[model samples]
Target: RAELGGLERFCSPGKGRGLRALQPFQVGDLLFSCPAYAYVLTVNERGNHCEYCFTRKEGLSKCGRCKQAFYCNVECQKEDWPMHKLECSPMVVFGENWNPSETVRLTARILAKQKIHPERTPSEKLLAVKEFESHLDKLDNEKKDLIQSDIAALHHFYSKHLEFPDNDSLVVLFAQVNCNGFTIEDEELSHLGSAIFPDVALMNHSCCPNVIVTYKGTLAEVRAVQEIKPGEEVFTSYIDLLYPTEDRNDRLRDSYFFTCECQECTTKDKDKAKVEIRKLSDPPKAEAIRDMVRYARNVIEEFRRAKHYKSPSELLEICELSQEKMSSVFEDSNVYMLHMMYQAMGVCLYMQDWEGALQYGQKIIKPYSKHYPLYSLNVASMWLKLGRLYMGLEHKAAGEKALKKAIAIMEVAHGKDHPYISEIKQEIES
Candidate 1:
């Protein structure tokens, strides 16, 4: 929590507790850093990612002792050992019955932490987690029943393996995690796991958030994307900002149990979200891209529903056709054009069309550099992919140049020896 500076927690009428800034923050200012002291690797992610650092490693070694998780190195394995020890026997005992949910898995860790630190009073061990809003009262009867069933099993596991004395409050803890937990994502922006960081949980939700949270290892860094004035409440988006105001509000209300009255929602069309096709000065060109977006979506949906899933080659092919039309009409720097190019690159990768991927990738780099944040790891990640594709196509000088740019950004976003950096270096050498 000491990582936070110029921040204070205060209460409001409509919302409960939210964090605010004491000083003005310029764009790209680091607001805070919150480490995931307790977390769970999602069920499918357990053996594929390092249990400690959450890094996806290629040849992760499973624990010979527990066989419950994997690690990038001995240090990570050792760091996770004490926590892993508690779950090992229960997993073995309940082998077939041990299909733990992500929430339960995380709840187990919170209980385990309590067991490990016997010096703290029982109440103190759980106070931090218990303080968060649970919204249990707002849950439907069906959800309540499900949480009841999960808590019963959770109680059994902790009581048997870790000797947890408190069973009644496990339901609240589970609900707290549901409300407050962060969906941990990798550099590629894939959801990998979930973690509870009390500090990050303190911020309220807004449809148009000024702050962005990105993860490095198990740490969450909050940065200002727009200038934040003194005494203004800090906000982060709980749902996708790419969604329209109505849809975003529905999601926030359904998931977080609140209506977002953020500036984007309350303002009478001061030109908000790119969720809808933005009207272009060139009417025909705007109409063209809109149709392309719709067609691409329909095709992707069709592919998703197929029994034998198909590649996105068709999407890429259509995107290529669309790009040819736009090249004459839209400027290279058009945000809408850049989005189409990004979609094209995504489909190309899904189809393993490296040449197509690089074609769109190269076209978008200039647009993306201007469009996205200077420090955004998302931009850097795209460049990393571009570098890899360039190398594959035997453009060594271009590949190295792109990779070096990616590495410089990554060193600040991640670190020097992160698995991402290592992979880029290995690809550059290759």
Candidate 2:
């Protein structure tokens, strides 16, 4: 924690406890690194990712007792035993029936860790897991019901190995996880797992953030995306910045239980540009824009629910129709339109329609670069995707250019020493 001399915790005006710079930091400077207090790989990633390190590998050793958790090697297996032991017996007993939500599994590990080590450690100096804001009072009835269901599963899965906290205490823990949990993703921005990094959670939310968080295995590395002066409060975004003000706030309010009053939210200068129409003949009315926003939200929600069950063509059809409707009113740069196009691109990739995916991917770059902050992982990942697509199509010159653009951003975001950077370098050379 001594290495974290650049930042110190301070109480902000309206944001409660937040981190501020104790010293100046140039762009791409490391702010601090936080190791996960507890984390769980997504159930779908169990076989592919190391249960201990969360690394993706071709073959992983399975836990001898549970046969559920997988690790990179015996060393990882041994290191994880203390925590994995908590779930092993339950998993074996339930067998195929052992399906716990990621939240439930994470809560179980946190409980086990707290029991074994009752004191806050050095990395938890800024904020302790128990100290995370629960916002229980602000939770709606539907959220409350979900929490209750999770609690019931927690007891069912962990009762034998762990002592049960009272319902009230458990409720606080679950609610905190709901608001404070972080999704750990790879360099390509694919989700690997979920975790709680107490100190990292201390940084408050902003649409225009000063820092970006990227992962190296289980470690969450925070780096300055913009120059930070001493006394300036550090901020990291909790939600996607692409949405218009209302949609962004709606997500913030629903999840974090606070409406952001950041500069971007207050002025909304970018919202006009995000939804601007190109045609001069007849511009979209305010009511038309509102209707389009509602329509886009509904389509997005439906697509999310349908993606797993629907065919690739079916999903692309949804994206196509939605994009067609929005095109009359929204520019290609419109966030909603870009979002649908991104989905369409993914569907094309799934269907092996490389040319189709490339067209959409190419159109996204300009707006993405304009909207996302410098060294943004979102923009970097898109470049990485397009780079590979171009290379697959034998556009060597264009592919190398795209890959180098990705490296320029990722070298700052993921750091020069990161393994992914070396891999990308070799990729560009090849």
Candidate 3:
């Protein structure tokens, strides 16, 4: 398809390496965007709004260690306070029914594949979050709501409920590294996203990449898709992109344990997706397969209680009946159950199914292009929902090629004086 220039790589494996763009770009220029280094402005499931200018919050508060998620005032949580004071007391020692956006996207994939230097404070991130919480059962099972007293109260709240007044001898030993087996959300995703990988962030891992790693609350950003060169080796894309290719390699081998040779898992391309998953009609009887898994688990708990209703139309009518029971069992292949495909493609991309909504909005930006670092904002909300599902399929070359790939995945970086980066630039001028 003629287009596939240079810059934009992430090597290893027969040397396909990336991270380029030292020059040439063009189309609306600005060749960079996702460059975060502090961005945990969460509030989860649309908390009033403002996750960096998304703004909405009218009152705010919640977040006293989970209560699920929130925080709007206190100056938008003091401009999204140092990533909520580095997981706010292990999220208030795991209260509020835990699952704070799956432990803030597993601590932004362990601070976006570490290289830590920007004067490494927070007491050297409490000894690298206590050596990745002494291997929290080796993190990475795609956020299973970790437990073990939620990894022993997040290692006794990172060795004494968030002390680090300059890094008080950082601890969280995990039973003195005897290294017990996985748990605690799989040791926080194989020990803070891959049992601890950092090398300026382990490269290589993509299903379609070019450079755009992001996060903003404990920052993480790495940009350049049209311009990136001089050495290369930088990619991202762990799973999500309408996961047709077999639940995106079963969630990148059960949450970043690896086993994804990339290129959408070495090409079976889930044997040509095109709305993939071809099965599940077996309800010829058997009480229609237990009323299709009991009406798809009671319309996914009434669309997860209509995504925490305060009244959003009672979770938009149970997210439209969990969007017609995930269009009759999401692209089949035994639907290894990821809970009715994130509750019917997260209520058909939050009921914005702009016609064929990139078949589940490219799976929430497929594992932050490798779970942290690929112009985050969940990969710019999967390149802004594939540029609004190619402007709802009118197709301006596939909607300005997914709004110029969501403005080249928001340019990233995190240590020039620390403030923030993942600048969406307001979706290429909306």
Candidate 4:
């Protein structure tokens, strides 16, 4: 397949492999889009999302073969069945016995597809994955044991039902998926699944990234948000750009297994988050805000580790308890409160609790609008999410209104034909 034009992959000193533009691209230029080599919807998203395109909607048809996957229609089902057939039996095997992590399932899908088609040799797959970066060496004993256990289960299933590779290959694939998988988010930036795009994975991280990634359905489209001169590296921020340098660095290290000393991190003057005051009431002190941010971060990290095991009722309870605790400790409009709100929204979405998701999604708008610029990606993304959440709740008029608002902001922020605007318009028309 043809990769994006005007870009070349070259090795750097500290950065192993990175993509650089060979020709200049003005701001808002579409760089490229390609389908993911492998992707798997989150466990909570199976029924609520289309297995083929990752579109979320109710009343999706479940696949008859495995009775585990769901599709938007017969067409989508047919298009995906060739791959899903490989996944179905194994999914059924693991589906009842244990809850596999997202990376585990995604790794399974890649293995299954490869068995049927043999796109690349096991050695090539291992080398491509291993080259990305491995965290197995850095993993704590506890996590190391847990991953090995998961890999053993995956290997057993793969070996019994179909052709499987060596133990080393399985371990490399698991660690690589964790290291470089992109959260397959919808237009609203709501994560539906995770994908590993080999070519797309080459773009290195930078806090002050010049490009933004959006989706045309399942294909990821990277577009330049800033002008790029020839021979300059094409960079994307792996972590949320809204965070300060310190926070961004910490997330990058923990998630990506590397500390980024990007230009944004090295520069002395870094962007600090600002408080947006509203006339409604007094806000928390800076110390209190920081305290809440710390508290929220700790709770979220802990919750994330255990969330996959928690039932909807248990997840809902945690969100409620955390909300009450944070509300009493922090100001209503505080930015830290926004963090807790997102946690709740995430759990709510997993549980398919549209009412609760809409509630938190709505509360976030005021604070988000105040802090971010009108064309800010975060603000626009949230609005797009709110629109879908509204539609999920059957509030058609409200949903259309939010979608329109998101489209207007997106047109200015991402340009007229950006995938975001096009998708939102399709949603409105549908």
- Output the number of the lDDT-best candidate: 2
Candidate achieving higher lDDT, 3 or 4: 4
Tens digit per residue, CA lDDT, model 2, 147-218 = 999999998888888898899999999999988888988777877889989999899999999999999889
Model 4, runs deviating above 4 Å: 1-3, 47-50, 53-63, 70-82, 90-95, 113-130, 262-294, 303-334, 345-359, 369-377, 387-401, 409-423, 426-430
Candidate maximizing TM-score: 2
lDDT of 1 by residue, 1-430 (tens): 2225698778855988778898999776788877775777777777778988887668998888668789998999899887777677878887878776778778778778766764533222222555778888898988778888778777777556665545457667777777777888775666788887777777888765778787777777787877899999898877754334565676788877778787777872522323334346755465675665565455434544641554466655556665565555445555445656777788788778899889888877865665444556667877888888988889999999999989887765564656778877887787
RMSD of each: 6.0, 2.0, 22.2, 4.9
lDDT at 209, model 4: 80
Evaluate residue 281 in candidate 1 and report its C-alpha lDDT on the 0 to 100 scale: 71
lDDT of each: 0.71, 0.88, 0.42, 0.72
What does candidate 4 score on TM? 0.77
Better of 1 and 4 by TM-score: 4
Tens-digit per-residue lDDT, 194-237, candidate 4: 88776677788887687877665566767787789998988877
Which ranges of candidate 3 are over 4 A from the true structure?
1-40, 43-233, 238-242, 245-262, 265-268, 271-341, 344-430
Give the RMSD in angstroms, all C-alphas superposed, for model 2. Answer: 2.0
Reference-based lDDT, residue 156, model 1: 71
Instruction: Estimate TM-scores for all models.
Output: 0.70, 0.94, 0.25, 0.77
